[PDB]
Amino acid sequence: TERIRNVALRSKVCPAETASELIKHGDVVGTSGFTGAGYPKEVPKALAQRMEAAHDRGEKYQISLITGASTGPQLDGELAKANGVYFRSPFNTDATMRNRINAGETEYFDNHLGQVAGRAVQGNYGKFNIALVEATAITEDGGIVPTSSVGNSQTFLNLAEKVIIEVNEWQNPMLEGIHDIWDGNVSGVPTRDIVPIVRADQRVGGPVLRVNPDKIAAIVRTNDRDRNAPFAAPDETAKAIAGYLLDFFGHEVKQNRLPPSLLPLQSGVGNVANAVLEGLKEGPFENLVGYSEVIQDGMLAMLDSGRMRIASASSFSLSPEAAEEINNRMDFFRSKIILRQQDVSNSPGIIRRLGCIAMNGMIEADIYGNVNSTRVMGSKMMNGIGGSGDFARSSYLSIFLSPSTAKGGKISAIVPMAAHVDHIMQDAQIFVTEQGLADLRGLSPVQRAREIISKCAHPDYRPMLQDYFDRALKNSFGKHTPHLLTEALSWHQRFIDTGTMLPSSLEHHHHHH
Amino acid sequence: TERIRNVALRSKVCPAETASELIKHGDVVGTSGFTGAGYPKEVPKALAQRMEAAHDRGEKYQISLITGASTGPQLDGELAKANGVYFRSPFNTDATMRNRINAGETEYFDNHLGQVAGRAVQGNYGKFNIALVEATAITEDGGIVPTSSVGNSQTFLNLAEKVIIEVNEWQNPMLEGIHDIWDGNVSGVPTRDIVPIVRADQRVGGPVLRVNPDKIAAIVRTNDRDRNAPFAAPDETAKAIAGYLLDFFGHEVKQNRLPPSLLPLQSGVGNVANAVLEGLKEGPFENLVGYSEVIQDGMLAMLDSGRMRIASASSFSLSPEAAEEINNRMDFFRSKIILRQQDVSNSPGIIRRLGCIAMNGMIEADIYGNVNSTRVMGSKMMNGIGGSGDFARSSYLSIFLSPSTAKGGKISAIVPMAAHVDHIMQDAQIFVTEQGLADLRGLSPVQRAREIISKCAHPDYRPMLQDYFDRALKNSFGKHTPHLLTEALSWHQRFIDTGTMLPS
C-alpha cells in the first residue's frame, strides 16, 4: 500500500539523481545507517556518479559524511570509490572507505558511538547541511518511521538545514512500532534530562522521528536491501572461547555473583559472538535480556524459544537468512525487540544502572590487559572504537574475547605492549581466548600479567611473553607496570618487517635458552 | 562538647593498640580518607608498630588497604614503612607507599574513583573484614558524622564485618551538616536507582553515615591533623596556561557555545589545575558552580571572591593555610559547599547530565592527544588515574593542562607516543601548555597532531616532534595514525639512558 501517508509531502517526491543535486561540495551530511542496516542507498549512488563526473573535469566534489555507525556498499562503498569523502565519522566497515582512510585520503575520527549526537549538537562536525535518512513510511502527521536502525537519525534531522528521505519498500511495513524515539534532552544543551530507563524492555518515547516538514526538500522512493553479511558460523576457536565464557558465567551464578538470568547482555557481532549466543541458547540460564547496540541472528533464536525475553538495540545485524526470518514474522518479533536512538542504547548512565555485561572483541591486549580495538600496528585503522568504550567502561563486567593469535598464527593477540590503546586496564576485567580465561578482578598490573600470560596467550608465544615480562621486572624504570622500552613494540616491527611475530633461530632470543 | 553523643556507644571506647588487634593478617580494610583528608590516624600507627614486631618474630602480618583516595603519613606512610600492605587501591600520594608500589613490594591498582564502591560491593577486593572510619562526632541516634571527606565511607561501613571508628577531636565540630549521604542504590546490586541530582547544588540525602551499632567493635578517641600539602603559587608557566584557557572560555561564551556562567566546573588535583582557578576568581564569568571531585585552595578562593556560588565535591584538598582559613570561617563556607559520596560526585551519568567542564593535569600527551596521567616512562607510578577518567570521558568539554616540559626542560610533555595511556584521543578535546592551546574538536589524528605540535610543544622539542611526524607520515604501516615503531618510545628511552630527551 501507500508508504507516504501524509498527502502534502508526496509533492516532494523526486528521482534519486535530482535529490542528489541538493548535496553540494563541502557539505556536512548526516545519514541513517548502523551495522549495515537502514542507511540510504539510491541517493548516495547517484551522488557518487555526479562526483566522479565532476572530478573528471577537474572540479572538486567531496562531502563530510557523519553516520550512525557502519553503512554498506551503496553508501560508504560508492562514495569511497568516487573519492568523494573528505571527512568520515564515527564508524566504518566498508573496505574501500577503509582504504581511503588508511591512505590519508579521507580524514577519520571514531568517536564513542553514544557520544556522536552530543558532539554533533555541540558543533564539533560543523553545521549540518543535509540529513539523508531511510524510512519505512511517513505517517499521516508527517512522522518519519525509521527502518532497520535508529542510530543518530533524530539528531541529524534536528540539525540539518535540508532533509532528504528515502522511502524503502524493501523494508517491512510492520517495522512501524518497533522503534522508540525520545523527545527528551539526551544529547542537547545542558542541563540534560534524566533518561528514566530502569528496565531493558522500557519504552520512553514514540514510534516516529520528528522533523519540520518545511525542511524536507526531497523524498525518494526506493526498493533495495541492506547489507546482510553472511552468517559467520562458529569455528572450533570460537566454540572454545564461548565454552570458557559460559563456564565462567555458570560459576558466577553458583557463587551468587550473578542471578540465574545473568544481567542485561551486550555483545558484538561475528564468529565469537555467534558462538556465545549459541552457548547461551543451550546453557542453563533462563529469562535472558539484551541491552546492546545490535540484534543478531542468535538473538532471534533465543527470542523465539523464550530463552531471551527482550532485546534492546539501535540496529539489526542479520544474515540474509535471518532477515528473511524476521520479515516473515515481524508481527511476532516486533513485540520482542526495541530499537532505540544510539545515544540511548549507548548511554553510560543507563548501561551502568542496568548493570550490563559487556562482551567485546579486540585486535590485541598487552600483558597488562590494555586493549586495542582499532589500529593494527598502531597506525592502520580496522573499523573503529564503536560503542566498545561506552559499554566496557560502564558495564558491571567488562569482557574481551579473541583468538589468541591472528593471521594464521603469525601474530600474537597478546603482546608486550599494545601498539594503540582503546581500553585501559581499568576498563577490562575478563579476557577469554581459546586457551582459557583470565579473571583479573582486584589484581595489580603485574598480577594481571601473570593471569593473562598463563591463561590466554598461545603456547607458541607464552615463553616470549614471559621472557619479556621477567626481564622487564628486573630492568624497568619502575616496577609497577614493568616494560623494556627498547623492545616493547619490537614484535609489531618484526611483523611489519618479516610478516611474522615469531622470531628466527638464526639470531639470539632470550626465551630460546 | 562530648563527641560521642550516643551514650551507649561510649562503652566501646578503647585504646588504638587494642583496636588494632581486631585487624588480622590478610584482612581487607576499608578506610575513610581522600586527598589527604579524613583518613584514620592512630589505629594505623599502632597497627604498623605491631606489624614490625610480628615480622621480626617471623610472623606474616599484612593487610589489603582500600580507601576513598589518597591519605597521609599516619596511614599510607606508617603502613608502608612497616612493610604491612600487600595490596592498595585506588589512589595514593604518599612517598613511602609510592616507593613500595614502584619496587613491587605493595600491589596496586588505581581504579576509576567513582567505580570503587561498586567494585567493592561486587567483591573485587574480597570480603571487607574491617571498616576504619574517622568521624567528627557520633550523634545521639548513632549516626556517624564524617570529617573532611566522604569518599567511600558509607560503602565500607555497609560491607565490613567489624567497624572501628576514630573520633578525632582535631576535626571541626562544625563539619556536621556539610555532608550529603544518599541512602539510595548508587553502587549496589543492579538494577541501580536513578540519582535525582539535576543541579550541582542539590542535596538529596542526610548529614550522617549510617551503620548498625552492633557492628562497631571499637571506638578510639584521637587527636591528630590531616596532611595538607601546599600548592605552588602560580608561576609564569601556570599563569600563561590559565590565561590561554580563560581566553578560550571567553570565546566560547562569545560564540554562544557556553553560557556566561559557564557550566559546572571540575578541577583536578595538582598545581596547574589549581592555578586556573586562581585566574577564575577575578575572571569575567560570574555565578559559577563547581561539581568536582575535590575543592582545592583555588576553588575555596573562588567561593571567597563570590565568583563561584556553590561547590560540590567529595573532599577538601586544602593547603595547611587554606584548611586553617575555612575552620575559622566554617559558617561562611558551610553553606557554599556540599560534600558527597565519591560514587555520586564521580558518577558519569550525573557528570554528563550536568554538562561538566573537566580540567585536569597530565604527565604527558602524545602528538595524537592520547594522555598519560600516571606512569612515568610507562612503568613508574606517580599518583593514579583517580577521577580523571570519570570526568574526562563524561564531560561536556575535556581539557588537559600541563607545562610543555618537565624536569627543568629535560623532558618534553608532548611526545611521539605516550609511554602509558590513561585517556584515549576520544576522551581529550582541548590541550593547554604555556606555549598555547590546541582545540582538537572534530579533527582526525593527523589533524590533531598538527595542532598539538604547533600550539602546545616547547620550541626545544617542536622540530623533533615535527620530524617524527613527517617521517611517520612517509613510512608508517598505515597513514591513519602514522607511527615509526622503531622510534615511537625512543625519547623515553633516551631519558632513561642519558637523563634528558634532548639528544647530544
Ligand SMILES: CC(C)(COP(=O)(O)OP(=O)(O)OC[C@H]1O[C@@H](n2cnc3c(N)ncnc32)[C@H](O)[C@@H]1OP(=O)(O)O)[C@@H](O)C(=O)NCCC(=O)NCCS
Ligand atoms: C576488534 C575487531 C576488529 C575484531 O573482529 P572479530 O570479528 O571479532 O574478530 P576477527 O578475528 O575476525 O578479526 C577481524 C579482523 O581484524 C583482524 N585482526 C584481529 N586481530 C588482529 C591482530 N592482533 N593483528 C592484526 N589483525 C588482527 C583480523 O585479521 C580480521 O581482519 P580481516 O578482515 O582482514 O581478515 C572487532 O571486534 C571491532 O571492530 N571492534 C570495535 C567495535 C566494537 O567493539 N563495538 C562493540 C559493539 S558491536
Ligand SMILES: CC(C)(COP(=O)(O)OP(=O)(O)OC[C@H]1O[C@@H](n2cnc3c(N)ncnc32)[C@H](O)[C@@H]1OP(=O)(O)O)[C@@H](O)C(=O)NCCC(=O)NCCS
Ligand atoms: C598528572 C599530575 C601528577 C600533575 O600534577 P601537577 O601538580 O598539575 O603538575 P606538576 O607539573 O607540578 O608535576 C607534578 C609531578 O609530576 C611530575 N611530572 C609531570 N609531568 C611529567 C613528565 N612529563 N615526566 C615526568 N614527570 C612529570 C613532576 O615532575 C612532578 O613530580 P616531582 O614533584 O617529583 O618533581 C596530577 O595531576 C595527577 O596525579 N593526576 C592524576 C589524578 C587526577 O587527574 N584526578 C582528577 C580528578 S581530582
Ligand SMILES: [Cl-]
Ligand atoms: Cl540519565
Ligand SMILES: [Cl-]
Ligand atoms: Cl577491580
Ligand SMILES: [Cl-]
Ligand atoms: Cl542516575
Ligand SMILES: [Cl-]
Ligand atoms: Cl569530536
